[PDB]
Amino acid sequence: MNIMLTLLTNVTLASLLVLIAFWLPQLNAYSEKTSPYECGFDPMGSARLPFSMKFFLVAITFLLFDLEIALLLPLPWASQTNNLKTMLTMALFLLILLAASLAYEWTQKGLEWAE
Amino acid sequence: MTMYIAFILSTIFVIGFVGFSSKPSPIYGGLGLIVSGGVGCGIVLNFGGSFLGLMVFLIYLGGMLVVFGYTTAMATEMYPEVWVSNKTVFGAFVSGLMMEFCMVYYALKEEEVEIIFKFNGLGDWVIYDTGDSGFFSEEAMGIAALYSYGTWLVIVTGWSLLIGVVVIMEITRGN
Amino acid sequence: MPLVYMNIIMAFAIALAGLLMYRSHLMSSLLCLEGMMLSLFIMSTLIILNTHFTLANMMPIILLVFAACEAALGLSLLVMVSNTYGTDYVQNLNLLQC
Amino acid sequence: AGRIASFLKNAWAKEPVLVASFAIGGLAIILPSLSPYTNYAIRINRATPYNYPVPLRDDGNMPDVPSHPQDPQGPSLEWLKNL
Amino acid sequence: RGEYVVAKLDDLVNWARRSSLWPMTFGLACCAVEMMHMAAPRYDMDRFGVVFRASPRQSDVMIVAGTLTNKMAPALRKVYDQMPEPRYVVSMGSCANGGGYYHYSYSVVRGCDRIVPVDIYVPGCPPTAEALLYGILQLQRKIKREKRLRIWYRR
Amino acid sequence: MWFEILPGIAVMAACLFIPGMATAHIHKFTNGGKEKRVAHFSYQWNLMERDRCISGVNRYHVTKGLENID
Amino acid sequence: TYKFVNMREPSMDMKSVTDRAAQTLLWTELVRGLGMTLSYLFREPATINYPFEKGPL
Amino acid sequence: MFMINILSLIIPILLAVAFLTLVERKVLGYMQLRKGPNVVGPYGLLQPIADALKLVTKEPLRPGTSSISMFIIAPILGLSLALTMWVPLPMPYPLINMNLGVLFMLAMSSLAVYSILWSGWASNSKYALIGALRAVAQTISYEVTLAIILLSVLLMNGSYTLSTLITTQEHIWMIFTSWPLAMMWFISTLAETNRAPFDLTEGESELVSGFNVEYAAGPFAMFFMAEYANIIMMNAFTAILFLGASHDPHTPELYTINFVLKTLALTITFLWIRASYPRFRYDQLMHLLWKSFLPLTLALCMWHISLPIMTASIPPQS
Numbered sequence A: 001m002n003i004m005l006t007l008l009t010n011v012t013l014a015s016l017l018v019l020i021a022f023w024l025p026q027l028n029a030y031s032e033k034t035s036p037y038e039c040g041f042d043p044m045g046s047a048r049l050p051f052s053m054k055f056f057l058v059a060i061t062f063l064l065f066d067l068e069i070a071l072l073l074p075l076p077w078a079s080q081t082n083n084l085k086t087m088l089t090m091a092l093f094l095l096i097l098l099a100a101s102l103a104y105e106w107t108q109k110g111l112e113w114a115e
Numbered sequence B: 001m002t003m004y005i006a007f008i009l010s011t012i013f014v015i016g017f018v019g020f021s022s023k024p025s026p027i028y029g030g031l032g033l034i035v036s037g038g039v040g041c042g043i044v045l046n047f048g049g050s051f052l053g054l055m056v057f058l059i060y061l062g063g064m065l066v067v068f069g070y071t072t073a074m075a076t077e078m079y080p081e082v083w084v085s086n087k088t089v090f091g092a093f094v095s096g097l098m099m100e101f102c103m104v105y106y107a108l109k110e111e112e113v114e115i116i117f118k119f120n121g122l123g124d125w126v127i128y129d130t131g132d133s134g135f136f137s138e139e140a141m142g143i144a145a146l147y148s149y150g151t152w153l154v155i156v157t158g159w160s161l162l163i164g165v166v167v168i169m170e171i172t173r174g175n
Numbered sequence C: 001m002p003l004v005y006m007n008i009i010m011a012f013a014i015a016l017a018g019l020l021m022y023r024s025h026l027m028s029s030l031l032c033l034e035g036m037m038l039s040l041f042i043m044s045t046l047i048i049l050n051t052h053f054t055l056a057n058m059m060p061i062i063l064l065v066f067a068a069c070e071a072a073l074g075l076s077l078l079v080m081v082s083n084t085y086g087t088d089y090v091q092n093l094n095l096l097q098c
Numbered sequence D: 001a002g003r004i005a006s007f008l009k010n011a012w013a014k015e016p017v018l019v020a021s022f023a024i025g026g027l028a029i030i031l032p033s034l035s036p037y038t039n040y041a042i043r044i045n046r047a048t049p050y051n052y053p054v055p056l057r058d059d060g061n062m063p064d065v066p067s068h069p070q071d072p073q074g075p076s077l078e079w080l081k082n083l
Numbered sequence E: 001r002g003e004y005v006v007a008k009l010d011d012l013v014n015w016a017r018r019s020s021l022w023p024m025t026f027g028l029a030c031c032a033v034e035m036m037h038m039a040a041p042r043y044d045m046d047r048f049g050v051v052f053r054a055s056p057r058q059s060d061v062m063i064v065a066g067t068l069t070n071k072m073a074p075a076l077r078k079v080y081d082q083m084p085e086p087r088y089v090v091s092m093g094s095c096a097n098g099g100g101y102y103h104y105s106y107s108v109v110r111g112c113d114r115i116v117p118v119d120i121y122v123p124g125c126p127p128t129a130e131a132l133l134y135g136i137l138q139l140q141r142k143i144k145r146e147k148r149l150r151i152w153y154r155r
Numbered sequence F: 001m002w003f004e005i006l007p008g009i010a011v012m013a014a015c016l017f018i019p020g021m022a023t024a025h026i027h028k029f030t031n032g033g034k035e036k037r038v039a040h041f042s043y044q045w046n047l048m049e050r051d052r053c054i055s056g057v058n059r060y061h062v063t064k065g066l067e068n069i070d
Numbered sequence G: 001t002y003k004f005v006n007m008r009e010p011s012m013d014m015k016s017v018t019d020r021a022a023q024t025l026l027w028t029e030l031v032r033g034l035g036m037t038l039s040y041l042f043r044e045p046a047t048i049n050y051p052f053e054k055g056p057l
Numbered sequence H: 001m002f003m004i005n006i007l008s009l010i011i012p013i014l015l016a017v018a019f020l021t022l023v024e025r026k027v028l029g030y031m032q033l034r035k036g037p038n039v040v041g042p043y044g045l046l047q048p049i050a051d052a053l054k055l056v057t058k059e060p061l062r063p064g065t066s067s068i069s070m071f072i073i074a075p076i077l078g079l080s081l082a083l084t085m086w087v088p089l090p091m092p093y094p095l096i097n098m099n100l101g102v103l104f105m106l107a108m109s110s111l112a113v114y115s116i117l118w119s120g121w122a123s124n125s126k127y128a129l130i131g132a133l134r135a136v137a138q139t140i141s142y143e144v145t146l147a148i149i150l151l152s153v154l155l156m157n158g159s160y161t162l163s164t165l166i167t168t169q170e171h172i173w174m175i176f177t178s179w180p181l182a183m184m185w186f187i188s189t190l191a192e193t194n195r196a197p198f199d200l201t202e203g204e205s206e207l208v209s210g211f212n213v214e215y216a217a218g219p220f221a222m223f224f225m226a227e228y229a230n231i232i233m234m235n236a237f238t239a240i241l242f243l244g245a246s247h248d249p250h251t252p253e254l255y256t257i258n259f260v261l262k263t264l265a266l267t268i269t270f271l272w273i274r275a276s277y278p279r280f281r282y283d284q285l286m287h288l289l290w291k292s293f294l295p296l297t298l299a300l301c302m303w304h305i306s307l308p309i310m311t312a313s314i315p316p317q318s
């Protein structure tokens, strides 16, 4: 209800903006406008070719770190436990493993944006 | 009537999945998964799983982000596919729509659908449980018990994530 | 077993079909594979929230953490076939024949 | 001796962020064991009654358990008030 | 009758266009440096709602600043042809207006008009920054005298 | 002459001003002058439900003291 | 005659290394520029009101 | 009157974003010896109206080499998420008391990638396809640091209830306890909103715009609205998170005034930074967080999780 009502209000409002944006103005609709653009020229025969890249490794280590961030998210609730000593050691283990993964990423090129 | 929302949240989950699995252009399968996850977050949320719902929201809308990250890198081509390119995808899609529609029609008429297991068409609001929670959310407290009772779980996971970054290093190393 | 269970089980069945019945794409197939675990994640959270299985509340994220790892390598494998072969289209994926 | 101090100085100059992070981290593990108040934190956490203290069936010969919620004997947390 | 409402509405629209024209820089020679001086603190183009910086996709006016050579001409043509309507092009400098010092060259077109329509001819070699700014103000008054919806209603 | 910026953010301030009291006042408007009773835990929800039932008007923020009972 | 522009190599005492580490960590030259631009914000804006006022000739 | 409260949330945020496009052009100019816009109405107060009308009545060009579905959906996502991400903010009485408001809003903060990617690829241009991946990498690689910073800061608050955050600060500004952390957090915020020091996506030499290249008129303006709404939203987030304020329940207006003043000050700091600093390079941009920011953030999180235990000062859960 309430929350869902706010989400509905926002999405419909956004859609009205885009509808007025895309419908209200008038265009002559001539062909040569469709020619694509690159700083004065057009993007020749590209802008969809497979992208020979290197920071793929950074992109994937993002996800691998995101899993561990999800793992350590429950911490504020976890600090409210009786056996605080075990929670302390084991959370510290989790952050140490974060740091160790980052360090192995570091020395073995890895997070070093590939060339 | 917004009574049936807890039903329809799953229903839009199903047909957003079919188009996601209808083998369309990879980004359109991604869009199907995205709407499926967005509507399934509501399914977990209205059952009380606030933290787990927002958790899957976060991690999964990062996870499909990264699978995009190579879709424009290691999966695009001169002519990317379109959700209307292949003729068979429409047939897959419509076969997605009519099966659960027929089954829910039966579950609305007989309430004893015989497909695979035993199921009743009498909504979902029944299966909830009366009770209370005091001043603590059960879901949050349960996921917090990971650092007190999850002795083995966090250890084996963290070890696996370390091994995962190692293998990700090694396979993509390129000699 | 109410309709929500039917819907997520049925979603898993079509994810099984979509990933396993390959059409032509490896990336879209592993995409269907990771949607598979989403269906299983929701399904698992359902009983666990339903039955007040307080400990098992941590099983989904645990179940989550490994599953993305699979995709973490899957797409990682995808680039390794891609740079040499050119695409993820699995019909040229034939060199290993005999 | 000299090598260790020189290496620390160079790290504090070459990668200062690394030494700051390593330091504050190394504290983060070794203080909680050394600190004399973590047991008090355990007392904090055990003090909070998230659930009801369901009473025991009285049958005689439990002087430790108070008969009344206003009784003097029983667990007390005046340390909590002073803290 | 309808002229009242349509005139007020189109007056609103042409005022909005007039006070928010976005130049597409396009400096080819010393006229570019003089335009840059015109955006300097002293004259402060940015005060009038003009924004100087604009990608050719999001822009209203092109200033052809400098000599336009034969090798340039296809690029300028593709730039203007992609420019969304409305698109008023101002030519600054004797070189861009027509010919220039290098009028009788072999690889310099004898005027931006032979390449692209020119809405305001700004003279000067270079046109001193405030003369450029005055040309911009003249284009603003031109946008003020705009009767699009009037002509639509009275077609 | 920095004060020329002062009108510019002033309306901006007013722009961010309105969501402040509007949510604050309407709550106070809706809940009988009281601010909204946040239910962050099921015990709060049970208290609100019992207050709604006791009110007899299906309005939780309506509250009756000892004068309501014998 | 000529002057070498950048040969001022730094020292390596504890004070100098502490100062450099503070400047790198506790961003200082960043704050220096961030405060200079502030000084220019409060200054008198150089702007001639065209066409009411024209440039000197 | 719930929907009235909603509208009283959206619409004023829209005017705030609108006049931010004036206050930036005035603040920047005054920072670089320019009078700024003061011709459209008094002191340029009417200038945002004119440009908005122009962009509404500017021709929206359809990218010929594009699938219109994403060319329209991406502005929808970028704009709607930006506004609905204002929903759970602790105004003296927050609109929606979501028990996990901070996590709610952090999760929605990651969704801007889901407008960036479709804008960059669907428009189908070299600048667009480059900038899409570059900006995506930027925002995703800074989202992690945002996450650990949020967790470490919250470990002293007590929960993910973002209304109790005020109750956390009350006495002292929270920055006084986590100034090393906030200094990172703020900067990472600067990175996530793609601002001049960390923008890297515009790059008007080799990326020109990066994502909003082929977007024109309305859908183009929608991404600006998202961008300059995230400015205000994240500056407000930082304002409450670290720059606490007083709130007497009998006088809700006091905290409202203090909070809006804090938000304006932080946005002015945004404009202040962008008006001075050069622009990062992608190499250095990711070097800044992978090599430098992330280890410090990890160590600070370890410090801020160990600290409540040793001080016997764990924050109240409820």
Ligand code: SF4
Pocket (backbone or CB within 6 Å): E029, E030, E031, E065, E066, E067, E092, E093, E094, E095, E096, E100, E101, E124, E125, E126, E127
């Ligand atoms: S008109 Fe004069 S100033 Fe302008 S480009 Fe030609 S020579 Fe240079």
